[PDB]
Symmetry: C3
């Protein structure tokens, strides 16, 4: 739906069980490039949501428009004030699901390749692998090449 990179992003929190803890993967994806940010958090309150959103922006640039679900972190006064103050349009009207699934498959593969190592490493390598290594179809480009 975005017409160029950083026009319109989609965001949701998805859940990932590892060692009997259910982590909150905060996931943002550009609707034009398919480029992704994901932050592994223990929670999904406004303090973690704003934080993941800043991580995403540091990696992808500032979006003009974000679309989320009606989850309460996204509807909090803290998140609306953030978006208003920094001129980010926020609406609340599949890309994220499909991106979640690709993330989780890479995350699982990296956990098994390196079982000794922390969850954060696997998330990181999943993230960078998807954006920079993965060649997309029909374009022949990576998300990173289309985005930047």
């Amino acid at each position: 739906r975005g017409l160029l990179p950083n026009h319109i992003w989609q965001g949701d929190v998805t859940h990932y069980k590892y060692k009997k803890y259910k982590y909150c993967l905060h996931v943002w994806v550009d609707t034009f490039s398919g480029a992704v940010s994901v932050s592994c958090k223990k929670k999904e309150t406004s303090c973690e949501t704003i934080s993941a959103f800043l991580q995403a922006i540091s990696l992808l640039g500032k979006p003009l428009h974000i679309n989320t679900d009606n989850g309460p972190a996204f509807l909090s006064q803290e998140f609306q004030e953030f978006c208003t103050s920094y001129h980010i349009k926020h609406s609340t009207h599949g890309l994220v699901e499909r991106t979640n699934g690709i993330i989780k498959n890479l995350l699982n593969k990296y956990l098994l390749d390196c079982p000794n190592l922390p969850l954060d490493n696997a998330i990181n390598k999943a993230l960078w692998t998807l954006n920079q290594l993965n060649v997309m179809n029909p374009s022949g480009k990576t998300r990173w090449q289309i985005h930047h």
Copy 2:
């Protein structure tokens, strides 16, 4: 005073009290874009000054010319050798104060939003928020957009 990004930077150390420790915020700011680096350090010796300066350069690019105060870390043989070896003009002739103040206000806001979380997180989110989110006047651009 700089004519384009990375022509001339201003640098100083400012102090920030948190939990009865006075941290040294090493702050560099581009005089053209207003783009900022800040590193939270426990000290301001040459080893920390060179380190913050490398953090700044990794984030902003290499400057042609830096201007500092006469603080001893900046006048150390270690810092002069660094600047000489890598062809960075160093002179020792408000932008930093005003930038300090904006940093500290964002840092305080993030500490109160997230009281449970470490100082480093608040510094980081202050830093990225100021460079990438904040829209400057009359230009309508962020520091990041002007700088890069």
Copy 3:
């Protein structure tokens, strides 16, 4: 041998003794820009090799072609599958040695400047110093300027 940045990289693991432990510096260098990645690892199995290679790619971009020695991490089924899946040509035919030496000299200098601080800090500052600060001859440019 590369005709522009990210055409052809050279990679090897070199060893660095610090406090009676022999670390594995995984080193990648672009044959055109001379730009470098180095990751300090405890080991050189496929899990660490793929990880250092992702660190390198995050910093330098995705290469078309990599050349390594016949070390077993590079010949592992895991590393060949990685290269095949993401369309990176891998051959197994001085740049790395000379780069190792420059890295190690900067690493030693930073350890002595800051003896109190961890090895990882010295590696990091060595890495960024070499890519961004060091002016190369006859070009007058840093590795970073040529690469990006």
